Structure formats: structure tokens, C-alpha cells
Amino acid sequence: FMLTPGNPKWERTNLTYRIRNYTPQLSEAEVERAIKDAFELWSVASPLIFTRISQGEADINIAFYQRDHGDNSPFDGPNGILAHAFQPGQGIGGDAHFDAEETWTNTSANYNLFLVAAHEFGHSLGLAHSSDPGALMYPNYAFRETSNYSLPQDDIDGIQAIYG
Ligand SMILES: CC(C)C[C@@H](C(=O)N[C@H]1CCCCCCCCCCNC1=O)[C@H](O)C(=O)NO
Ligand SMILES: [Ca+2]
Ligand SMILES: [Ca+2]
Numbered sequence: 266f267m268l269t270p271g272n273p274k275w276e277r278t279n280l281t282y283r284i285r286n287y288t289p290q291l292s293e294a295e296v297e298r299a300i301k302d303a304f305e306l307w308s309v310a311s312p313l314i315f316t317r318i319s320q321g322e323a324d325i326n327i328a329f330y331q332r333d334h335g336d337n338s339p340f341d342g343p344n345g346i347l348a349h350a351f352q353p354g355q356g357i358g359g360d361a362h363f364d365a366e367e368t369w370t371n372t373s374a375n376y377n378l379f380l381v382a383a384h385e386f387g388h389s390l391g392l393a394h395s396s397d398p399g400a401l402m403y404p405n406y407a408f409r410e411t412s413n414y415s416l417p418q419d420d421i422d423g424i425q426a427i428y429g
């Protein structure tokens with residue numbers, strides 16, 4: 266596992282998140298469920314607790330954007346890069362952005378939103394990419410059975426390293 270350079274981290278263990286917009290590919294409930302499950306993966310392996318808020322400023326903003334959206338990391342249309350997130354900090358810090366031009370799913374078809382969101386939240390918490398191909402923080406998307414999916418050991422060692 267690899268920690269984000271400078272070892273950024275949240276000082277508080279109770280964090281909020283807000284879904285600013287949705288993709289037309291899934292129902293709002295389906296998007297909400299995928300995001301919640303993604304956060305819960307991290308909760309089982311750390312002392313962090315995440316709460317959804319419907320108005321106000323959340324620690325982690327979740328949004329669907331396309332091409333150039335003003336943050337210096339433009340998306341690239343279908344395929345290529347799927348999403349990106351920012352290290353712990355105020356404002357844009359901790360936020361997660363998903364490429365609106367992808368076909369998002371909750372199945373084995375590309376690109377399962379749950380698995381992508383799970384990976385992004387690792388960044389939101391201070392983790393960098395892993396060189397273990399079996400790790401969630403590995404830099405390439407790969408479908409894994411989602412029903413009883415839990416965090417691989419490398420990812421556990423990583424968040425424990427920061428918050429344990
Ligand atoms: C791990 C994934 C959920 C996010 C990263 C990502 O989008 N990786 C892509 C790398 C491959 C690009 C080369 C094209 C190959 C076609 C595959 C399409 C799916 N894309 C990827 O797997 C993202 O870079 C990231 O690390 N964000 O935190
Ligand atoms: Ca893309
Ligand atoms: Ca933020």
C-alpha cells in the first residue's frame with residue numbers, strides 16, 4: 266500500500282458526504298445504495314463513520330462531471346479515466362468526481378459504480394495507489410463479485426496505517 270505524499274488525513278472520524286447530482290444511467294436510489302456500500306467497506310476496516318447530508322457543506326462532495334470542469338484534471342469521454350478524488354483537506358479536499366460520459370452500472374457490465382466509488386474514497390481518506398494487483402487501490406478497474414465483497418488485506422493495512 267502507499268500513503269499519499271505528505272500523509273494528509275482527516276482529524277475528525279465522523280465525516281459527512283453529499284451527492285450533488287446523479288447519472289441518468291441508474292435510479293437515484295441505486296446511486297445512493299452504491300455510494301453507501303462503498304463508504305461502509307472503509308468503515309468496517311477503520312474507526313471512520315460516514316453520514317449523508319441533504320443540504321449544507323459536506324466534507325466529501327460527490328459529483329458527476331464531463332471533460333473540462335475547472336479543477337485542472339479534465340475527463341476524457343467514454344472509457345479512459347473513469348473518476349478521480351482529492352486528498353483530505355478543506356473545500357475541494359476529499360471530494361470525488363465521476364466521468365458523466367461513462368455507462369455506470371450496478372452489475373458485472375462496465376463500469377460498476379460501487380467498485381469505482383470504493384476506490385475513489387480510498388483517495389478521499391489519504392491513500393495512494395498500490396502495486397498489489399489484488400488491491401482495491403490498484404490503479405486499473407477490474408470487476409469483482411460485489412455481493413459479499415470486503416476490503417483486501419493490502420487496503421486494510423493501508424487505512425489502519427493512517428487511522429488505526
Ligand atoms: C481504479 C479506477 C476505478 C480508477 C482509475 C482509472 O480510471 N483507471 C483506468 C486506467 C486505464 C486507462 C487506460 C485505458 C484502458 C481502458 C480501461 C478503461 C477503464 N479505466 C481504467 O481502468 C483512475 O485513474 C484513478 O486512479 N482514480 O483514482
Ligand atoms: Ca472517461
Ligand atoms: Ca470537501
Ligand SMILES: [Zn+2]
Pocket residue numbers: 330334336338349362
Ligand atoms: Zn474533477
Ligand SMILES: [Zn+2]
Pocket residue numbers: 384388394404
Ligand atoms: Zn486512483
